[PDB]
DNA sequence: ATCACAATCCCGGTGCCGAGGCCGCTCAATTGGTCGTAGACAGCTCTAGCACCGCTTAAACGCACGTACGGATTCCGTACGTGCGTTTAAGCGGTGCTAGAGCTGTCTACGACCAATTGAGCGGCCTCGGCACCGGGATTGTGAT
DNA sequence: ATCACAATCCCGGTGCCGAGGCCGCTCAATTGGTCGTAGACAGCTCTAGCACCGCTTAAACGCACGTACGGAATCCGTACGTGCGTTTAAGCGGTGCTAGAGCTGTCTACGACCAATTGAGCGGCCTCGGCACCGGGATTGTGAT
């Protein structure tokens, strides 16, 4: 358990997040638990998007995540869509929806 | 035998479905290159663009216009219409805060 | 000293520029240029004074015509080889229009040669719904250069008759 | 030859994906998008934590600053679960 | 003969391309006056982003507008773009 | 007797309230609403008077801008009355509503 | 029950400042809901700021910080 | 020693160059802050303040008043297109709104 | 005693007296002007910090202060603010 | 066009409080000199952006047609606005309190910094399965019979 | 309603190339220790946020009434979608050229930093005039003639 990420039970790099916080000009000091906490949050959000992306890939009977699957995952979940509401994902397309007034009667 | 012709609108629905299912860029690449270079020539002469730079501009532009057209369609439906008119785009951009 | 910085809004600068440009449109004040003979090109325009980018160069004046007369006159000029092709199409709002400059007059926007690597471009200028096509410098031009622009004919058959792409 | 070092979250996003979907892969474009997402969220949370530190005249980012930043940024259940799992991570880190 | 006509690059965003962009937004029916109008708006959008982009290129003392510069210009306008970083 | 035609008093009122800067929502009901809302998030919360005043400033500015967008939406629909669908459209275009 | 403290004439005055000539009868409840949503969104952030400061009082600075986090910066309260 | 001439007077500015430099250093924006950076930033701040105050004073004199109130600042910002773009997502307390009614609403 | 708060009140007042000698400013309006100066300072300085971080520079010079000014302020404001800033930096350099 | 008529605008007095100016201090901006390192500048590499040429053909363009729809008109009923009188609760002003915000003083745990160690993560390479393209059969939405 | 019939979905065949896994290196994360100091906390002060009470109108509310307008139905013209045939220029790919993006080295001048100083700014205080409210004639959209 030499690496801090292994100590914290995380896959994201606690040490690299610590270095980025130290070099990012946020404050002159960064606590010991701040990189651990931020890495945990980052890997949680990564897992949350990747699970829905894998679900979209399965719905498309594909075994690889592509930008389309990430876009579908982000825009399908309301909270993820709110978190990523002001971003555009390259080669992601848009959600398939035709307005009910547009559908023929 | 009278030749077959689809009723107006159903081909539009099919185009909507296919272009919402796909992710390929809808604006031609080289005309977008030319427009970007011509519009960037008012800011700095003798510029160069990375291929990925114009790629990013095209993706951004496309996404912007698709969101604008979705808002325009909503503004058209609000006016009890199905056609999108220029006033719909003006209203969408006024509400979005661009104008 | 009541120091009040003067900052023209981005609603008067283009207004103070539209009327600063159209005052060479309705007028024929075509100064700063001369007529010369260029090898293989015949009559051409030479800049006698320094031009910066965005500076008005010369208006392309002629008879403003519709397409229905445009095609007939184009056929007429095709029939007569010595008449020449001085005519020039364009688009405006939702309709196409054209300018005819075949009639030899003192207007000097018609006497400009062609080049894909030129120094000027043609732009539209609307005056009460009336289009006017104006050649404007694309970059800083010193005095003595020949004025050139792109004829906008990258067609297969047009190149057959007049194959002056570059150089 | 021997181009310079470039830092990215590719391997860690891959490990997280293998933990969640062990038989699902990810393309280079989707991996780049995941990297951009991780960088964007890291920058956003770190900026909010810096704002929290400057607002309260504190010169350090602690786990509490990052927790408050996450509560500010992520909406709804996302904030709750991110806070819970970050607290679990800091507890496990301090235990060992 | 000849087909002497001015060409401007804003018309490179053709009417069918605009139609496709509107279809992806879910538009059945499009007025003919949309195209020019939306052409203009595209230009406006470009006039913003590229300007910001070129400003970035001016600060780095570069003559090439890189993808990262466009990403920065978009992120400035609250239009963050994913997949082009790095 | 005398009775103004409908709408004219509305225009007079529009001019009146667009000339003035005074807060339009009564302060005590707004403060009670703020306290009730904040009770959900943290109990036994005290509010600075300036804090409630800032909340009222922001709330009234937001509602006024929203009603301006709503009026534009109503006029777009060839109407003069603003309707809840107009508010919904304005919020959806602004991106607040899903 | 305090949401009804934002009375009908208050909504009418807010619409008048927005330039609204005629107001539908269902506008009032929709506007009350919109104001409630906006207030909850701002107040949550403000109370988060107070919690981080370990304060039991929601100050003006916390409110303006909450507004600024949402891109609605407020001038005149110490920002 | 020599006479202390500050740094705003060196650049001909009213805004405090030294205070802007101190805020830049204490704002933790970068590891180092150039000498001319606070001067440039103070000059820009002074120019923007001068523009806002000029338009606000014009608005106040238009309303037959000699003191700038928040309403005059709001009128100055919202009447100037560029300042309105700069302060688009900015709410001015006790500023109200521009007086404008849509043409359709007016009686015919 | 103590209770000392930093503000731009006197500087905004001095520039007002330069631009409008015969007018004053109220406490609320002065507070709004102070908030405006703080907001613009923070915005330009944040953009300058981002500019320095993008180009791997650890110093905020006048060049990226100018670049931040050009990025934030719209066209004519950007041009005139750049003019004023360059004039001030030239005067400051000519008085070392 | 013509009429009175409530609502608005204007001019003048008054108080009165918030803005504008002055005094002392103190804390920060200034002056001066050192150090070291971030950055400017010069030089080299080689990457990739630009530019061209040919051909294929997918797509854009141009045209004729008809039909779905945008838009103007009309009318009906209701649901708004406007004004009245009654209720109520906002607001002002005053009093009491006390919880908590803000400051001070100790100091202890905590984080930056440094030397050294090494292994996690980078790039480069290979390789083979997911996937794109394609062809064919079956199934399906659509619109006229 | 039934059936062409154009469109789409589903079954593999097969080649492509890019995702993934392995190996070498290397440099950045880790470990251990030192030291300065940031903020955790204990206590004091005293500010203002809360709670209550009592009139006092300003404001909200409930009702009546009628008028404008929202919305539905109808008819008409037009303009846009659909398909077809022509053209055109997008795109691919292949080849060169050289501009400059990126990296490396040096040397330097520029900014952090420290110490001592003093003066500008801020808190505090006074005083005084401009703005808000009252009160009376000038005015001006406004609704009925
Ligand atoms: C606009 S008219 C120019 C007027 C006319 N050629 C003269 O010189 O008086 C275009 C005609 O000039 C000729 N032309 C245009 N550009 C040329 C060039 N670069 N070299 C030779 N001939 C040119 C073409 O043959 C075309 O028919």
Structural domain that includes position E72: 9-76
CA dihedral F41, F42, F48, F54 (to 10 degrees): -10
Q: Which residues of A, range 61-100, sit inside 8 Å of D by Cβ? A: 63-67, 69-70, 78-80, 82-84, 87, 89-92
H and E: helices and strands count for chain F: 4, 2
Please count the structural domains in chain G: 1
Closest residue in A to F98 (Cα–Cα):
A78
Ligand 1 shell residues, CB under 6 Å: C 40-43, 84-86, 110-111, 113-115, 162, 164
Contact at 8 Å (CB) between H74 and H95? yes
In a domain, E4, yes or no: no
Domain tally for chain F?
1
The whole-angstrom separation of Cα D33 and Cα E52 is 23
What CATH number does residue F10 fall under?
A: 1.10.20.10
Cα G44 from chain centre: 11
Is residue G75 a part of any domain in this protein? no
Backbone dihedral angles phi then psi of residue G18, each to the nearest 5 degrees: -80, 0
Provide the 3-class DSSP secondary structure of residue C158.
helix
Strand positions, DSSP E, chain B: 48-49, 83-84
Q: Rounded to an integer, what distance in angstroms lies between the CA atom of residue F12 and that of residue G7? A: 21
Q: Answer for the pair G42, G26: CB distance below 8 angstroms, yes or no.
A: no
Task: Give the CATH class of D2-96.
Answer: mainly alpha
- Residues G78/I34, Cβ–Cβ less than 8 Å: no
What one-character DSSP code corresponds to residue C87? -
Instruction: Classify burial at D21, counting beta carbons within 10 Å of its beta carbon; exposed 0-12, middle 13-18, buried 19 or more.
Output: buried
Q: Which residue is nearest to nucleotide K99 (CA to C1')?
A: E63
The shortest C-alpha distance from C132 to chain I (Å) reads: 28
Nearest to I76 among C1, C3, C7 (CB): C7
3-class DSSP assignment, residue A14: helix
Q: Which residues contact F83 (CB under 8 A, 6 or more apart)?
A: F74, G24, G26, G27
Identify the CA nearest to E21 among candidates B64, C137, F22. Answer: B64
Interacting residues of G78 by C-beta distance below 8 A, sequence separation 6+: F50, G60, G61, G64, I31, I35
Residue I54's closest CA among F22, E69, D64?
Answer: E69
C125 in a labelled binding site: no
CA distance C142 to C48: 8
State how far residue A91 is from chain B, nearest Cα, in angstroms.
Answer: 5
F49: nearest nucleotide, CA–C1' criterion: K49
**Residues from I in contact with E at Cβ < 8 Å:** 47, 50-51, 54-55, 63-64, 67, 70-71
Residues I42 and H85 sit within 8 Å (Cβ to Cβ): no
Which residues are CB-neighbours of F62 under 8 A, at least 6 positions away?
Answer: G35, G38, G72
β-strands F81-82, G22-23: how paired? parallel
Characterize the bridge pairing of strands C33-38 and C42-47: antiparallel
- Residue in chain H lying closest to G77 (CA): H93
Strands C63-65 and C95-100: antiparallel
> What is the rounded distance in angstroms from the CA atom of residue E10 to the CA atom of residue E46?
11
Nearest CA to ligand 1 atom 19: C114
Nearest to residue D12, comparing CAs of G58, B50, A10, H101? A10
Q: Are B79 and B88 in contact (CB under 8 A)?
A: yes
Q: State the DSSP string of H2-40.
A: -----SHHHHT-SS-HHHHHHHHHHTTS-SEE-SHHHHH
Instruction: List the structure tokens of C64.
Output: 């403003």
Ramachandran category for residue A57: left, alpha or beta (phi over 0 → left; psi -120 to 50 → alpha): alpha
Cβ-proximal residues to A105 (8 Å cutoff; 6+ apart), any chain:
none
CA–CA separation, C73 and C76 (whole Å): 5
How many Å lie between the centroid of ligand 1 and the Cα of residue C28? 23
Q: Rounded to an integer, what distance in angstroms lies between the CA atom of residue G49 and that of residue G70? A: 14
Tell me whether H53 touches chain G (CB under 8 Å): no
Spatial contact of D40 and E80, defined as CB atoms under 8 Å apart: yes
Residues in chain E whose Cβ is within 8 Å of chain D:
80-86
Residue A35 · residue A14 · CB < 8 Å: yes
- For residues D74, D75, D81, D85, the Cα torsion angle rounded to the nearest 10 degrees is 10
Q: How distant is the Cα of B54 from the closest Cα of chain A, in angstroms?
A: 13
Domain count, chain A: 1
Phi then psi dihedrals of residue C114, to 5 deg: -120, 145
- Put simply, whether G77 touches H (Cβ < 8 Å) is yes
Q: Which residues does B60 contact at the CB level (< 8 Å), separation at least 6? A: A88, E49, E70, E74, E79, E81
> Whose CA is closest to F30, among G42, G67, G17, H89?
G42
> Strand, helix or coil at C39?
coil
Q: Are H27 and I45 in contact (CB under 8 A)?
A: yes
Whether the CB of C2 is below 8 Å from some CB of chain I: the reply is: yes
Can you give the residue range of the structural domain that contains H1? 1-108
Q: Which residues of B touch E12 (CB under 8 A)?
A: 28, 30-32, 34-35
Distance between the alpha carbon (CA) of G31 and the C1' atom of J7, Å: 31
Chains D and C touch (3+ CB pairs under 8 A): no
Residue span of the structural domain in which B54 resides? 3-99
> Taking Cα atoms as reference points, which of B52, B51, B54 lies closest to residue B35?
B54
Per-residue DSSP letters for D29-56? HHHHHHHHHHHHHHHHHHHHHHHHHHHT
The percent helix, strand, coil of chain I (3-state, each to 5) is 70, 5, 25
Tell the CATH superfamily of the I1-95 domain.
Histone, subunit A (1.10.20.10)
- Whether residue E83 is contained in a domain is answered as no
Contact E36, B81 (CB under 8 A): no
Of how many residues is chain G composed?
79
Instruction: Name the burial class of residue I93, with classes exposed (0-12), middle (13-18) and buried (19+) by CB atoms within 10 angstroms of its CB.
Output: middle
Closest to D93 (Cα-Cα) out of A28, A38, G51: A38
CA-based max dimension of chain D: 49
Distance CA B76, CA B84 (A): 5
Closest CA in chain A for residue D50: A26
Q: How far does residue C40's CA lie from ligand 1's centre (Å)?
A: 9
Tokens of A72: 């579908």
Chain I residue numbers with beta carbons less than 8 Å from the beta carbon of C10 are 74-76
Residue F14 vs residues C121, F10, G15, G20: alpha-carbon distances, Å: 51, 6, 8, 7
| Nearest nucleotide to A17, CA against C1' atoms | K29
Angle between helices A33-59 and D63-73 (to 10 degrees): 30
CATH number at residue E25: 1.10.20.10
Say if CB F62 and CB H93 are below 8 A apart: no
Q: What does the alpha-carbon distance between residue F66 and residue H91 come to, in Å, rounded to a whole number?
A: 13
**Quick check: E12 and B31 CB within 8 A?**
yes
Burial B18-47 (b: 16+ CB within 10 A, else e): ebbeebebbbeeebbbbbbbbbbbebeeeb
Q: Where are the beta strands (DSSP E) in C41-84?
A: 42-47, 56-60, 63-65
Longest dimension (CA), chain I: 48
Please count the residues of chain D.
96
- Are I38 and H90 within 8 A, CB to CB? no
Question: Is residue G50 helix, strand or coil?
Answer: helix
Ligand 1 atom, smallest distance to C43 CA = 8
- Chain J: bases < 7 Å from a protein Cβ: 5-8, 18-20, 27-32, 38-40, 46-50, 52-53, 59-61, 66-71, 79-84, 89-91, 99-104, 110-112, 119-124, 130-132, 142-145
Count of C-beta atoms within a 10 Å radius of residue C96: 13
Confirm if C99 and C62 have CB atoms less than 8 A apart.
Answer: yes
Asked if G73 and H89 touch (Cβ cutoff 8 Å), the reply is: yes
Angle between helices A33-59 and A67-76 (to 10 degrees): 100
Please state the domain extents for chain D.
2-96
Q: Is A25 left (phi over 0), alpha (psi -120 to 50) or beta?
A: left
CA distances for C12 relative to B99, C52, C138, G62, angstroms: 18, 22, 23, 42
Helix extents (H) in chain D: 10-20, 28-55, 63-73, 77-95
CA distance C135 to C130: 17
Identify whether the C-beta of residue E13 lies closer than 8 Å to the C-beta of residue B35: yes
Decide if B72 touches F, using CB distance below 8 A: no
* Contact between G67 and F54 (Cβ < 8 Å): yes
Strand partners, C35: C45
Closest residue in A to D93 (Cα) is A8
Q: Is C113 annotated as a binding residue?
A: yes
Query: In E28-85, which ranges are continuous DSSP H helix?
Result: 34-59, 67-76
- Tell me which DSSP letter residue E5 carries: B
The alpha-carbon gap from B92 to the nearest alpha carbon of chain F, in Å, equals 6
CA C144–ligand 1 middle distance (angstroms): 19
d(CA F79, CA F77) in angstroms, rounded, equals: 5
- Structure-determination approach: cryo-EM
CA pseudo-torsion sign D74, D80, D84, D87: positive
Length of chain E: 86
DSSP H or E run through I9: helix I9-19
Question: Is C7 one of the annotated binding-site residues?
Answer: no
Q: Which residues contact H78 (CB under 8 A, 6 or more apart)?
A: H84, H97, H98
Q: Of B83, E19, A77, whose CA–CA distance to A95 is shortest? A: A77
Contacts of C72 (CB under 8 A, 6+ apart): none
Residue with tokens 């309230």: F17
Q: Quick count: other Cβ atoms within 10 Å of Cβ A61?
A: 6
Q: What's the CA angle centered on C89, arms E1 and C102, to 5 degrees?
A: 60
Q: Is G5 helix (H, G, I), strand (E, B) or coil?
A: helix
Q: Compute the half-sphere exposure of residue F87: CA atoms within 13 Å on the CB side of its CA.
A: 24
Pocket test for ligand 1, best of C37, C44, C104, C113 (most atoms within 8 A of CB): C113
- Are I77 and H83 inside 8 Å of each other by CB? yes
Tokens describing residue H31: 């590891």
Please tell me what DSSP assigns to residue E13. S
């Amino acid at each position: 358990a030499k690496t801090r990420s292994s100590r914290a039970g995380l896959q994201f790099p606690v040490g690299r997040v610590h270095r980025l916080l130290r070099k990012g000009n946020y404050a002159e000091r960064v606590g010991a638990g701040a990189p651990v906490y931020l890495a945990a949050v980052l890997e949680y959000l990564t897992a949350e998007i990747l699970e829905l992306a894998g679900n979209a890939a399965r719905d498309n009977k594909k075994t690889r995540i592509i930008p389309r699957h990430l876009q579908l995952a982000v825009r399908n979940d309301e909270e993820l869509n709110k978190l990523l509401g002001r971003v555009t994902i390259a080669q992601g397309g848009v959600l398939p929806n035709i307005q009910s007034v547009l559908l023929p009667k | 035998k009278k030749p077959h012709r689809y009723r107006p609108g159903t081909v539009a629905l099919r185009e909507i479905r296919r272009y919402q299912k796909s992710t390929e860029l809808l604006i031609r690449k080289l005309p977008f290159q030319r427009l970007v270079r011509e519009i960037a020539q008012d800011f700095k002469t003798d510029l160069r663009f990375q291929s990925s730079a114009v790629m990013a501009l095209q993706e951004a532009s496309e996404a912007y216009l698709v969101a604008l057209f979705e808002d325009t369609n909503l503004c058209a439906i609000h006016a009890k219409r199905v056609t999108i008119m220029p006033k719909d785009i003006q209203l969408a951009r006024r509400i979005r805060g661009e104008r | 000293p009541v120091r009040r910085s003067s900052r023209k809004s981005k609603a008067e600068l283009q207004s103070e520029e539209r009327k600063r440009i159209d005052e060479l449109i309705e007028s024929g004040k075509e100064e700063g240029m001369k007529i010369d003979l260029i090898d293989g090109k015949g009559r051409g325009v030479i800049a006698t004074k320094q031009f910066s980018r965005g500076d008005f160069v010369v208006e392309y004046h002629g008879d403003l015509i519709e397409i229905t007369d445009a095609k007939k006159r184009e056929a007429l000029y095709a029939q007569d080889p010595s008449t020449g092709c001085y005519m020039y199409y364009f688009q405006y709002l939702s309709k196409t229009y054209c300018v005819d400059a075949t009639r030899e007059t003192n207007r000097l926007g018609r006497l400009i040669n062609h080049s894909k690597c030129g120094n000027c471009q043609t732009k539209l200028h609307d005056i009460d719904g009336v289009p006017h096509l104006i050649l404007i410098a694309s970059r800083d031009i010193a005095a003595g250069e020949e004025l050139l622009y792109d004829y906008g004919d990258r067609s297969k058959a047009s190149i057959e008759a007049h194959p002056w792409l570059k150089h | 030859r021997r181009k310079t070092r470039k830092e990215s979250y590719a391997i860690y996003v891959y490990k997280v994906l293998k933990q969640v979907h062990p038989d699902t892969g990810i393309s280079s474009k989707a991996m780049s998008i995941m990297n951009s997402f991780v960088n964007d969220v890291f920058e956003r949370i770190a900026g909010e934590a810096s704002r929290l530190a400057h607002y309260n005249k504190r010169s350090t980012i602690t786990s509490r600053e990052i927790q408050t930043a996450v509560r500010l940024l992520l909406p709804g259940e996302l904030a709750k679960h991110a806070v819970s799992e970050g607290t679990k991570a800091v507890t496990k880190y301090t235990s060992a | 003969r000849h087909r002497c006509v001015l060409r401007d690059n804003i018309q490179g965003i053709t009417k069918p391309a605009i139609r496709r962009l509107a279809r992806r937004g879910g538009v059945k029916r499009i007025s003919g006056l949309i195209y020019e109008e939306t052409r203009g708006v595209l230009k406006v959008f470009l006039e913003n982003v590229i300007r910001d982009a070129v400003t970035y290129t001016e600060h780095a003392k570069r003559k090439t507008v890189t993808a990262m510069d466009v990403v920065y210009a978009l992120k400035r306008q609250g239009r963050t773009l994913y997949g082009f970083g790095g």
